Design an enzyme around this catalytic site. Sequence first.
Site, short mmCIF file in Angstrom:
data_model
loop_
_atom_site.label_atom_id
_atom_site.label_comp_id
_atom_site.label_asym_id
_atom_site.label_seq_id
_atom_site.Cartn_x
_atom_site.Cartn_y
_atom_site.Cartn_z
N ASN A 121 -12.50 2.41 3.84
CA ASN A 121 -11.12 1.71 4.05
C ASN A 121 -11.28 0.49 5.21
O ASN A 121 -11.80 -0.72 4.90
CB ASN A 121 -10.03 2.70 4.47
CG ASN A 121 -8.65 1.84 4.62
OD1 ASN A 121 -8.82 0.72 4.75
ND2 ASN A 121 -7.79 2.79 5.07
N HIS A 175 -5.52 -4.16 -7.60
CA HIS A 175 -7.17 -4.26 -7.38
C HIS A 175 -7.64 -4.48 -8.66
O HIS A 175 -7.18 -3.87 -9.94
CB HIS A 175 -7.89 -3.25 -6.77
CG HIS A 175 -7.76 -3.30 -5.36
ND1 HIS A 175 -8.69 -4.40 -4.63
CD2 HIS A 175 -7.31 -2.92 -4.21
CE1 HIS A 175 -8.53 -4.37 -3.07
NE2 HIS A 175 -7.67 -3.28 -3.21
N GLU A 188 -10.97 -10.78 4.14
CA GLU A 188 -10.39 -9.60 4.69
C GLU A 188 -11.63 -9.32 6.12
O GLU A 188 -12.63 -8.90 5.60
CB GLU A 188 -10.16 -8.63 4.04
CG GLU A 188 -9.74 -7.27 4.65
CD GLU A 188 -8.80 -6.23 4.07
OE1 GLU A 188 -8.51 -6.37 2.88
OE2 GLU A 188 -8.63 -5.14 4.73
N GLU A 193 -5.27 -8.68 6.00
CA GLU A 193 -5.55 -7.96 7.54
C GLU A 193 -6.81 -8.52 7.99
O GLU A 193 -8.06 -7.74 8.07
CB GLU A 193 -5.91 -6.53 6.97
CG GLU A 193 -4.70 -5.97 6.16
CD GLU A 193 -4.75 -4.19 5.85
OE1 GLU A 193 -5.86 -4.09 4.88
OE2 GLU A 193 -4.39 -3.71 6.59
N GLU A 245 2.98 -5.35 1.07
CA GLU A 245 2.87 -4.19 0.42
C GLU A 245 3.82 -2.98 1.04
O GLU A 245 4.32 -3.05 2.40
CB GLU A 245 1.33 -3.66 1.19
CG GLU A 245 0.21 -4.58 0.87
CD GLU A 245 -1.24 -4.08 1.25
OE1 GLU A 245 -1.21 -2.79 1.80
OE2 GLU A 245 -1.88 -4.80 1.66
N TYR A 246 4.36 -2.18 -0.04
CA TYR A 246 5.32 -1.07 0.88
C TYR A 246 5.16 -0.01 -0.21
O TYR A 246 4.32 -0.01 -1.49
CB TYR A 246 6.79 -1.69 0.58
CG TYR A 246 7.39 -1.82 -0.83
CD1 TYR A 246 6.91 -2.63 -1.79
CD2 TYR A 246 8.51 -1.08 -0.92
CE1 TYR A 246 7.43 -2.66 -2.95
CE2 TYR A 246 8.99 -1.01 -2.28
CZ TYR A 246 8.71 -1.90 -3.01
OH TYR A 246 9.49 -2.00 -4.37
N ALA A 247 5.76 1.37 0.05
CA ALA A 247 5.79 2.30 -0.87
C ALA A 247 4.25 2.77 -1.26
O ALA A 247 4.25 2.65 -2.44
CB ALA A 247 6.70 2.17 -2.05
N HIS A 248 3.60 3.06 -0.12
CA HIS A 248 2.34 3.63 -0.56
C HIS A 248 2.19 4.98 -1.49
O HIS A 248 2.58 5.93 -1.29
CB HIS A 248 1.57 4.12 0.90
CG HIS A 248 -0.09 4.15 0.90
ND1 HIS A 248 -0.58 5.25 0.96
CD2 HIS A 248 -0.73 2.95 0.92
CE1 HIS A 248 -1.77 4.92 1.03
NE2 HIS A 248 -1.89 3.74 1.08
N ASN A 262 -17.17 7.60 5.08
CA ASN A 262 -16.32 7.35 4.08
C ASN A 262 -14.66 7.72 4.34
O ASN A 262 -14.43 8.30 5.32
CB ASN A 262 -16.41 8.26 2.65
CG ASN A 262 -16.53 9.62 2.68
OD1 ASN A 262 -15.53 10.23 2.41
ND2 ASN A 262 -17.76 10.10 3.04
N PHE A 310 -8.36 7.94 0.00
CA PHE A 310 -7.50 7.04 0.39
C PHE A 310 -7.68 5.73 -0.58
O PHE A 310 -7.00 4.73 -0.58
CB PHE A 310 -7.63 6.37 1.82
CG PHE A 310 -7.01 6.97 2.92
CD1 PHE A 310 -5.69 6.49 3.02
CD2 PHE A 310 -7.11 8.35 3.49
CE1 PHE A 310 -4.47 7.11 3.94
CE2 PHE A 310 -6.48 8.89 4.48
CZ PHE A 310 -5.30 8.37 4.57
N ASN A 356 -4.23 5.24 -4.64
CA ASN A 356 -3.00 5.15 -4.24
C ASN A 356 -2.16 4.39 -5.42
O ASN A 356 -1.00 3.89 -5.08
CB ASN A 356 -2.98 3.94 -3.00
CG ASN A 356 -4.06 4.18 -2.09
OD1 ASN A 356 -4.86 3.35 -1.84
ND2 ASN A 356 -4.11 5.53 -1.36
N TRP A 381 -0.07 7.50 6.50
CA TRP A 381 -0.71 7.73 7.69
C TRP A 381 -0.13 7.98 8.98
O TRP A 381 -0.39 7.77 10.32
CB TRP A 381 -1.88 6.58 7.96
CG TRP A 381 -1.21 5.20 7.82
CD1 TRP A 381 -0.69 4.37 9.09
CD2 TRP A 381 -0.95 4.37 6.76
NE1 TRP A 381 -0.38 3.20 8.56
CE2 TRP A 381 -0.54 3.22 7.09
CE3 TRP A 381 -1.45 4.48 5.34
CZ2 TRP A 381 -0.15 2.00 6.22
CZ3 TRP A 381 -1.10 3.35 4.52
CH2 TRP A 381 -0.57 2.24 5.00
C1 LIG Z 1 -4.87 3.72 7.95
C2 LIG Z 1 -4.23 2.43 8.19
C3 LIG Z 1 -4.33 2.07 9.60
S1 LIG Z 1 -4.89 1.02 7.43
C4 LIG Z 1 -4.34 1.10 5.64
O1 LIG Z 1 -4.75 1.81 4.61
C5 LIG Z 1 -4.11 1.91 3.47
C6 LIG Z 1 -4.89 2.91 2.79
O2 LIG Z 1 -5.01 2.80 1.39
C7 LIG Z 1 -4.22 0.25 2.84
O3 LIG Z 1 -5.58 -0.10 2.61
C8 LIG Z 1 -3.23 -0.49 3.71
O4 LIG Z 1 -3.47 -1.81 3.22
C9 LIG Z 1 -3.98 -0.43 5.06
O5 LIG Z 1 -2.84 -1.43 6.05
MG LIG Z 2 -7.60 -3.25 5.28
NA NA Z 3 -6.48 2.35 -0.42
#
Ligand SMILES: CC(C)S[C@@H]1O[C@H](CO)[C@H](O)[C@H](O)[C@H]1O
Ligand SMILES: [Mg+2]
Ligand code: NA
EC number: 3.2.1.23
Lengths: 211, 1015, 174
Positions: free
Chosen positions: B94, B349, B408, B453, B529-532, B589, B593, B596, B991
Amino acid sequence: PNHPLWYTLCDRYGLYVVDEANIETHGMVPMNRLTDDPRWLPAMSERVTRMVQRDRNHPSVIIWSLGNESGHGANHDALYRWIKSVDPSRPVQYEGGGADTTATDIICPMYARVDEDQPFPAVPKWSIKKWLSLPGETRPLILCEYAHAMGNSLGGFAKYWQAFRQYPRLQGGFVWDWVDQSLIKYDENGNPWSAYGGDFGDTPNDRQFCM
Amino acid sequence: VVLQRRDWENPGVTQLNRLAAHPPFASWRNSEEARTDRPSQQLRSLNGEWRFAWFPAPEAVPESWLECDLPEADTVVVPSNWQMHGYDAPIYTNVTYPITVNPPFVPTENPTGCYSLTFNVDESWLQEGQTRIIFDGVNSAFHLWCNGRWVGYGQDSRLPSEFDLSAFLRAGENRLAVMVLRWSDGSYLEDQDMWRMSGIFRDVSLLHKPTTQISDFHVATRFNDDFSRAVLEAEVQMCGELRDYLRVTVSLWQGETQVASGTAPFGGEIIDERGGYADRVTLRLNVENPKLWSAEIPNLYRAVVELHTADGTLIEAEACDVGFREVRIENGLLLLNGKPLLIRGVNRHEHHPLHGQVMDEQTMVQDILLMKQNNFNAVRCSHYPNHPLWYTLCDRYGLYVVDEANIETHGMVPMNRLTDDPRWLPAMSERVTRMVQRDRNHPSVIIWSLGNESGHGANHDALYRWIKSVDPSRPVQYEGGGADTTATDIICPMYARVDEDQPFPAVPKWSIKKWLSLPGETRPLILCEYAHAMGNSLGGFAKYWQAFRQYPRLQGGFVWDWVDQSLIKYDENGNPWSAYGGDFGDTPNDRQFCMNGLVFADRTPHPALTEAKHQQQFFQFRLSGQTIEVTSEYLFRHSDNELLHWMVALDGKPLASGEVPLDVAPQGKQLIELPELPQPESAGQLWLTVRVVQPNATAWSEAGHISAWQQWRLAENLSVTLPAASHAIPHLTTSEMDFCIELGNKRWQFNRQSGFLSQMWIGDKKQLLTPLRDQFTRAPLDNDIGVDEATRIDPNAWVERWKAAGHYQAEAALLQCTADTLADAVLITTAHAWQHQGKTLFISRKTYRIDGSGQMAITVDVEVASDTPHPARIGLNCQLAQVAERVNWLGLGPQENYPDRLTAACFDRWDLPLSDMYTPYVFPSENGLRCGTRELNYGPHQWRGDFQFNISRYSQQQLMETSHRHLLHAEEGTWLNIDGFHMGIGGDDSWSPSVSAEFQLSAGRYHYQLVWCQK
Amino acid sequence: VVLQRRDWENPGVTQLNRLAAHPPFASWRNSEEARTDRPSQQLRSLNGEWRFAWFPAPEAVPESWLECDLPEADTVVVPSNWQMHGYDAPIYTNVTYPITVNPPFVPTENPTGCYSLTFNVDESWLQEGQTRIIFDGVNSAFHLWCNGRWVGYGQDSRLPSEFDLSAFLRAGEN
Ligand SMILES: CC(C)S[C@@H]1O[C@H](CO)[C@H](O)[C@H](O)[C@H]1O
Ligand SMILES: [Mg+2]
Ligand code: NA
Ligand SMILES: CC(C)S[C@@H]1O[C@H](CO)[C@H](O)[C@H](O)[C@H]1O
Ligand SMILES: [Mg+2]
Ligand SMILES: [Mg+2]
Ligand code: NA
Ligand code: NA
Ligand code: NA
């Protein structure tokens, strides 16, 4: 940018300094051919950025200049913003593309006249008194070059200073320029004489315009 | 020379002899072919079978490879990622860089892909004009040789690199040698949260251009105040010898109709003191009543750019689709064609589970179709420019696009270390500028993005201004450095919440409602980005949409994200399984994550998709007595492919239905009056359901497509009738170790030691495999877990709060267990304490009442200590001996739903196969829950009350102990979880605790009641 | 390699191995010296008598010049403009470029100035720390070598180009 000692002396003796990036692309057609080409943005940025990194601590530097006579290009706008962002303490000026573009905090025309408009297409040189009050214009006006001191010249110099003193937002300018660019040559007798463009076999030349 | 320079460890070299970026070219030699977007003879694909060798570093590449094919090189498909063929491992990390953070240096051990192609070149291509090769995607850098001679070098993985092979090719047979490095200095700007792969993963092709060519063209549409008049302005640039006889014609086409045309010779307007651009011309075409492009109606025109001589001879033609639309921010609103947008967006993606990061037309169309079918209208190219075909499809199908520069630098400390470094400005600028140069003509691109980011550095401000300067037609956005910096036209936070401030130092995530009105703030807010959507998620998604609809300057956002980034691996049998981070021996790794998505990697919907579809509906509803108020949230289109189905049902049983065609103007309203609905005799709750159905097929939907729905409780008639006085009276067999209840062939066994219903008998058949026990935990969801790992414990995550309090190892201790014979029933009263280290966590008080009808009325009352973290659920579980094919329930459905993700579910009678009652999240957790259920039927069993439940062959224990879904085994019988109460699932991010207070089980005291019987 | 890249005809390459720009440094090892802006033992001038040879093009430069002083060369004062010593003509032109407008290319006949200096570095300078060379102004572009080994390349005539020589130097003559 000048020899480093220059800023030290200006700090110590007391002169206001415009620090100019080493970018002039005058000979291009049109003037902004490189400065609007993003492929030339890298080369342009290093000339702007490395200046700021060198000279930013010198008090005498009060204005940053983005270079000279390179028209107006997107590259100018990007680097204008870069400086405003990195060093808020100093205004940014640039004359190219008509002296009042989005790349200058200062209306900085060269050889714009006191009363007389020179209404060139695309890039007019308005009379400095008129320029200030054009619709929506708020900025100060300081001539980056005026009163071309070529040989017997400075006719009408007083007219500028009457304008400067009468108009708050007319805040002066920079005479062009300090010193004749003549070089020493020697004749058959070994006597030194002042030489100009064309005296070194250099051609094409622009003759006495270096003075 | 090539080995000596190390151009891949120098951010001052990003390209060598690379040609200029430009919009999509095909160099048509026939106008009509150009007008119709049909194949070009001048654009040859080099996709297909290529030679490929692998090396541990570029230094280990034999000098012979440049001139001779290597015999050990296998034949492989191009485009491809070489990790997908198995040459080395794909790495999922990530934030932390997959390499050592030492800019600009990469590892000495730098995996190298030595691609080669022997290919034929026509003589007519080399006798005149120019021949370029176009690599649409090479990750992450490469050197290029043609027939042994060095051509050039290129960086930026996500944009086409182009080189001139004119002086390099010979007629007949030629060989290309592409040395691709996995790691370059470009990698420092390519730290997106995704699988780290490499290779020639996008189309390679050859393009032939006349020496006198169209080198560039830009298309602009400006409008009058009401969009009844337009001016199309097309700027054309050329390369080659300038001649007076040269002309450019730009013609505009709607279908086969030429709507406008203009012709001019070269020579632009005077620009400055030195004149104008002699090598350019601008054409202005007046268009009256243009058909406007939007995502709602993707009205498209075709512009054809003809480079020709004055005597009518065509030299070459280029073209493009043209959408007439204006994007502007005014008075704090993002307007499209003068109308305020509501972004129903998603991040996407470029990911295939088989082919990796290679993209194909079919997958692209499948995504688009799915997004549109689920009420999405916008997409963010997270976090790089896409495959060129993607924009064409968004142009044609109608999606608003955010085009993101491939920048990024997440892993840097601080995040802006590079982006504030002026030495990294050139490399960054190339990624922004070449994006804009390539994609500026696509109508679907409405917003430029500066990357993702990478904190906020001066380089962002410089590039921000550059785009604003070069293309005023689109807003620029960038989230970095706090989402509201001077580098963004739009407040575009990631995972900012609706009501809750997260006041991080320097970079706070304010509640989106508060953010808008911070002193001096005026900009629109669209969440980048919202609603993970990580696993069981999208809890509280409705809360966002309520806010979007209520606040004008809250104009939506982009869900994170579209598709799970799982990869296909194969076991010893050869069977396929979905793999995530660490399944390839990659380390460090970030495990699951990478997953999503709203859809699985194969594009199978997650339960969450239906929630997004419902909240992103384009029609809203109000019921007032008999009247249905329908409000359109469309900005441009009338409801001209919409009819409203309505249905009144009593506890599942239909009573009256009907249809009314919808005729709602954009943003308008339609009143619909329900016919006097018949009164029902029987007891129960009447439910009105409305559905919006598109009768006709579209480009994106089949006929009968349901686009929107809504439900209301109508009249409720409470049951007042006493059930008939039953004849049979059940008998209590009091034993030392048991209480037994008997009614005919039915038997209930209550173990006097534990305090639970240990067994039930129907004749000789046992019903339970495990006793009926209280449950207060769940197999933790990704949201419950967070960034918590065994290597580094986060004590704040729900799973850890629970673990630390002992919720998972809490043992039941009997306090009371008595029986009583009532007049017509037996009553089993019990009391239990769940304790851990002397702390009473929960007390469960129960009565079981078994009467003559053979009904077990369970009454449960639970105490929860106030100082223990709020439990995942307050329920019961047991393992049933039965295994049935069908599950039948009266409640919310059909799909999985949780308390904070149940708005899309409808109350009704549902009948699904047992398999459907399980959601196959790649990482197993609690799943398959259905809420607000009044009746559940499984085989002989019926349960009644007001509860939530899941039902499967999988225990909570197995789910929480198993890392991957493919490692799961059906247990004997059927595991049933019936909850009086269930904690929300959260998802605002994955997170930190993200379950809202109203969805936490905080009451202290909880009551629920079940009735169990055979039917 | 230097001959083969032609970095003076590529606006993508403006420097190679050049150190970051910064405000004027002296690296005083004594505070009072720094307070009074007195000279610094850590900042040496390399001005004075250098060896110089003129070539019509970089192609015309013999490979031998990298390690040996060329006998044809004269001894000249630095800083200087080689036009001022008379090696070729200065050109006065206002607007029109002195060379054909064909970006990024320059004329094949490109007056090359080959400067060299034999100088001594102290023992103490190489045992600890970093020894950088500062060219305050070189017009218009240059490749540097130290003791035969290539150091880097630089453009922009009016700003200092700095390169690290810690790895390249030996005690005594360089
Ligand atoms: C763990 C956060 C501090 S970073 C967080 O990780 C996510 C995981 O899918 C996404 O990549 C988000 O874009 C990122 O802000
Ligand atoms: Mg990132
Ligand atoms: Na991700
Ligand atoms: C001759 C004009 C069109 S250009 C004019 O030339 C001058 C000659 O001294 C100066 O260099 C000025 O800066 C320049 O604008
Ligand atoms: Mg590099
Ligand atoms: Mg160069
Ligand atoms: Na004044
Ligand atoms: Na002059
Ligand atoms: Na809104």
